[PDB]
Amino acid sequence: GFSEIMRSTLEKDNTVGTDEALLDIYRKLRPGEPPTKESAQTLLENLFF
Amino acid sequence: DRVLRGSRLGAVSYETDRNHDLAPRQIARYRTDNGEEFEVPFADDAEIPGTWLCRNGMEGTLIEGDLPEPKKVKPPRTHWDMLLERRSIEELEELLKERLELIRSRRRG
Amino acid sequence: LYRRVINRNNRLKRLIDLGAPEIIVNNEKRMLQESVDALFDNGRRGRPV
Amino acid sequence: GAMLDVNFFDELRIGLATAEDIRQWSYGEVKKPETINYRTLKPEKDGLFC
Amino acid sequence: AAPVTHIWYFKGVPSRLGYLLDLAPKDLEKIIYFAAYVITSVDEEMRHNELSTLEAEMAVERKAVEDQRDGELEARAQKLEADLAELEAEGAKADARRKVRDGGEREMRQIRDRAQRELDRLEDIWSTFTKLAPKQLIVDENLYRELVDRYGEYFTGAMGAESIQKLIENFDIDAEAESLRDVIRNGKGQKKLRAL
Amino acid sequence: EDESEALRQARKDAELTASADSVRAYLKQIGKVALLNAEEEVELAKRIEAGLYATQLMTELSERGEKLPAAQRRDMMWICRDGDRAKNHLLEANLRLVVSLAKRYTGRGMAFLDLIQEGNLGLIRAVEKFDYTKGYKFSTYATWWI
């Protein structure tokens, strides 16, 4: 709430919906693969945790 | 461990490059299939073969029309041969008739 | 590199002699193309051999 | 020009070589990947050292 | 047993093949590794004659397609009248009697969307066949297959190094030379820099 | 959401990729056609053997033989072409098993795509010598040749 730059990137994200961001992450990182939401869902869990 | 002494598989014998007299040699003018002529210097007492593998990579025959007729080997094996070595004549005829009736049922029903 | 190019070219010539589907022939020709690329400059286009 | 290159040159014309130039250069079409026979240690027929 | 492009005249910057054919290097790598086809040649006379006859043919095809689509509309209307007979003739709920109608409308929407998507694909392939020209890339294999088996005349299209050899075969250096001389004579800006 | 058009649109953008990994390009290529079952393989072997005998008999009648009717000539020519179309269908169907076998033979001498390609040539040999009347699945017989 205090963070100004985080607030400006909060309003400036142009993507709402968690899986709508998940496919964005998968499309930027993967490209050459279908969305298949659960495969994008596990990947961010797989890549860091 | 070793002293790193290399040697290619070759022999070096130093004689004088003499050019005054040599062995007398004929010349065979081989010709390929695609109108290409090549020359091989063969000796006098030398059986000249009718065909020869020239620099073009194709089997160049001798341009003198001797034509020794090698009568080459059979074609190795075809898929027809692989079919025929396990099936029967009336079996293939029956399958032909089945698929012919199938094209009847396809086109005209 | 010369052995790779000779191998893939002879296999491609065998494949066209055999009569092969389009996917196998195109994959073989792409392999031959990448082999000649590796011969003239390895490590230029993508992964070095 | 030269083929054994006795020392009298003036120019070294580089040039983009065509397929006719390459198959006119060569002395034979190598068509086998066999380098050296495994036992007799001599170069093979139509191999890379033929 | 099949031609090959030299990597020096393709991958070095600037790509000399890319300048000689005025292709982008992304397009060049997409061609010469068999990732996308290229229309190496095209016809004109057969193109415009059968453009007339085939615009009539694709209009016939779209008419039969719309006949299939409103036949699907008739089938959905009959199933919706079945939903009427099963929702407002016996004892049914207030909103479950209309959720079946909303599901039938959903089915009609996705059915007409399917017919609309193949309609747009047929329209796209007709637009592509009208705007066909040499040195054009065609990505999306299925579109190239449909274009080939529909209009296998009027053009040739190969893929890879043999297509590149065909392209340099059908290329006058003098025509492109005088074209670029005229462009560096008259033009300006980024077109002048690229033309130089 | 399956029918979310951003998802299938991103799929349509993701198939439009460069993919300089040529192995990944070939795998994306072979992932297109779907896999068969036993009745499919039986029908394909039927078409292959029928078209083989059809082009054999057409070769026989091509030498000095019967002047064929245009109709019988047309249907047997369609049979001949459909046999090889089914054959290419079979090979392109079973490319994936070849990749499954050659994924374990890697790492010693040959590279990966050379292994996949020679497995494909063995697959061609297997579907040449494959019999369907023995009542076994095709992958069982093809595994030996691959």
From TrEMBL, chain A:
It comes from Mycobacterium tuberculosis. It comes from the Bacteria. DNA-dependent RNA polymerase catalyzes the transcription of DNA into RNA using the four ribonucleoside triphosphates as substrates. The chain holds residues 247 to 295 of 1172 of the full protein. The RNAP catalytic core consists of 2 alpha, 1 beta, 1 beta' and 1 omega subunit. When a sigma factor is associated with the core the holoenzyme is formed, which can initiate transcription. This is DNA-directed RNA polymerase subunit beta. Belongs to the RNA polymerase beta chain family.
